[PDB]
């Protein structure tokens, strides 16, 4: 019972979780998010378009990890620490602001680690089923959209 918009979000977190687990580390650079709603944007570097059978295992690894209903943990700590902790996977292609010194770090224990400030579920499961909507490779750009939505 969080907004739609909050539960989208943290849905972010469980879908890239689920990306790297099935494309490994060469998509583990995040380029943007968006969220409108129920539904969602996932945008990673990446080099080539998956394939059918692999984006069918990106949505069926989401939906288990909500089904897990793992805490989605957060941790304030300073920036410095953190990058000692989680170094620079916690973070996207486009770094956080400098100036700033307190870092929330969000985890989902062997599934993703981010560093960002908005607000989340406290579990996973309390996101509902996920449901893929389209997969797009920008060959040019070597960037990967991952369309979702939240059937709730
Ligand atoms: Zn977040």
Do not use: C, Q
């Given at each position: 019972?969080?907004?739609?918009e ?11 979780g689920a ?8 998509a583990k ?6 969220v409108?709603?129920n539904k969602?944007?996932?945008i990673?570097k990446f ?12 949505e ?6 909500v089904?897990?209903?793992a805490?989605i943990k957060?941790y ?6 953190a990058?000692?902790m ?5 973070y ?13 770090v ?8 981010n560093?960002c ?5 406290k579990?996973?499961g309390?996101?509902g089923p ?7 490779f920008?060959?040019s750009?070597?960037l ?9």
């Open positions: 019972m969080y907004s739609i909050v539960r989208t979000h943290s849905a972010l977190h469980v879908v890239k990306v790297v687990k099935v494309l490994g580390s060469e650079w995040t380029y943007s998010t968006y409108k709603g969602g944007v996932l990673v080099d080539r378009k998956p394939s059918d059978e692999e984006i069918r295992e990106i069926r690894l989401a939906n288990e990890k089904k897990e209903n805490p957060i304030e700590l300073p920036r410095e620490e990058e000692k989680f170094g620079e996977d916690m996207d292609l486009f770094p956080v602001p400098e100036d700033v010194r307190i870092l929330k969000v985890v989902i224990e062997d599934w993703n680690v560093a400030n908005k607000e989340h579920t579990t996973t309390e996101i996920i449901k893929i909507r389209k997969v797009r920008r060959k750009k070597g990967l959209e991952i369309h979702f939505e939240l059937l709730e």
